């Protein structure tokens, strides 16, 4: 299948991403606490529901939450300021909280049922969000021997997600909080996000030599994000 592209709301970021975040791919955004990772997730959960000529995929959303940071009223606000019905947009987001990393892994399996269910409706699932991808794994797998073990569990989790993305033509979007490195990653595309002067947000592609050089810059607004 041809890949689809979901607009972020930012023309700058869209150009950096070559039109938007891709289906049949896992896109990881990573950065420090407060850089706007969860805002980008909220914005995409609306943008994907737009028709294709407005940058969306007429799609449904599934959302796995590990830090209780999902905000339905924020979805409503973004939808409202982009011309969409707030409650209809919320209704097309299926939401689960992952209790721990093991539950998080099972939920990917659980998600496939709804993905199958909607596949030939007018609004198939087109976006699967995992926020945070790594927080449970960080907290549970720690100390001597944990590096190998945690990386193995995470790779397995990511493989499950890659399968859904490829099998059902879905964009997977995941967040990862970073502080201080050198660890392997298996996301299709990695985007480094940081908060800059005057509240602007700046995004850069990491280890993507064949993709645009440069940084995109946007603001967090009532429309989600915009240039």
């Amino acid at each position: 299948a041809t890949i689809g592209r979901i607009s972020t709301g930012s023309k700058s970021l869209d150009k950096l991403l070559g039109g938007g975040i891709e289906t049949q791919a896992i896109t990881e955004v990573f950065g420090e606490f407060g850089s706007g990772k969860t805002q980008l997730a909220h914005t995409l959960a609306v943008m994907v529901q737009l028709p294709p000529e407005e940058g969306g995929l007429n799609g449904s959303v599934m959302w796995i939450d590990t830090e209780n940071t999902f905000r339905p009223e924020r979805i409503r606000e973004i939808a409202q300021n982009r011309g969409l019905d707030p409650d209809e947009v919320l209704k097309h987001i299926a939401y689960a909280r992952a209790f721990n990393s093991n539950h998080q892994m099972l939920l990917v399996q659980q998600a496939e049922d709804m993905i199958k269910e909607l596949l030939n409706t007018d609004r198939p699932v087109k976006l699967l969000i995992v926020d945070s991808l790594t927080s449970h794994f960080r907290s549970e797998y720690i100390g001597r021997g944990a590096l190998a073990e945690r990386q193995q569990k995470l790779a397995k989790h990511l493989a499950d997600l890659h399968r859904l993305a490829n099998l059902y033509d879905i964009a997977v979007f995941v967040t990862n909080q970073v502080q201080a490195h050198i660890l392997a990653h298996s996301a299709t595309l990695r985007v480094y996000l940081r908060k800059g002067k005057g509240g602007k947000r700046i995004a850069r592609l990491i280890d993507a030599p064949h993709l645009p050089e440069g940084e995109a810059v946007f603001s967090i607004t009532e429309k989600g994000i915009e240039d």
């Binding site: 409650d87 209704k91 987001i93 299926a94 939401y95 689960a96 939920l107 659980q110 998600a111 709804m114």
Partner: peptide, 4 residues
Amino acid sequence: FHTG
């Protein structure tokens, strides 16, 4: 998973 739950709606909304």
